[PDB]
Amino acid sequence: MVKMIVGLGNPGSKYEKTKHNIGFMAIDNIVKNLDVTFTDDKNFKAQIGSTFINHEKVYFVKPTTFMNNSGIAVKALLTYYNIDITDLIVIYDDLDMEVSKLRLRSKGSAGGHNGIKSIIAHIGTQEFNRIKVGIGRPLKGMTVINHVMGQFNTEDNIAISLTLDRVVNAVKFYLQENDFEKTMQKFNG
């Protein structure tokens, strides 16, 4: 009945172009496509848009707790609406994929990603559905922070935009089928 779709990132003008905000960018593209408007929530520290698709109510969420606190918002939202982990999708930047690459997974450990780390620690599992967008592989010796805090190279803007459009379609397919596994089969590769 209720779907919780979360895009990760950091609030504030200075973070807006960072690769670590690919989740925010994805959610933005999704709601614009779906004609869904945001509202900076009074209960939750997040930007939230929702709408009924058929008989289901879908929430599109951009936590504004800062990335390392994403789990607090996710857990609050799951608890508030009595939504099980299985009804979750998290959209975010993969730390070790070529830029604009798209991958759907239903698992994976945090691997240095502070948002995913927070979510895992708050909902108690790494077994949750993910739509990952590649931001580039870090060079040897490069720290996670300056890897994800950098902006996208201008030659990559088009690839990123193309990928985000694909994320919109994956979400729609997912909603149509209420099956993330089929969505993974339909979109991976």
The residue ranges of every structural domain in the chain are: 1-189
Whole-angstrom CA distances from 113 to 33, 43, 70, 116, 182 are: 28, 26, 11, 6, 26
**Under 8 Å between Cβ of 62 and 73:** no
Q: List the resolution, Å.
A: 2.2
Q: Which of 20, 113, 122, 147 is catalytic?
A: 20
Is the domain 1-189 a CATH 3.30.750.24 member? no
Q: Is 10 annotated as a binding residue?
A: no
Tell me the residue type at 32.
K
Concerning whether 122 is annotated as a catalytic residue, the answer is no
161/67 Cα distance (integer angstroms):
22
Q: Is 114 annotated as a binding residue?
A: yes
Q: Is 66 annotated as a binding residue?
A: yes
- The three-class DSSP label of residue 111 is coil
Q: At what angle do helices 157-177 and 180-187 cross, to 10 degrees?
A: 140
Q: Is 68 annotated as a binding residue?
A: yes
Q: In the PDB record, what is the listed experimental method?
A: X-ray
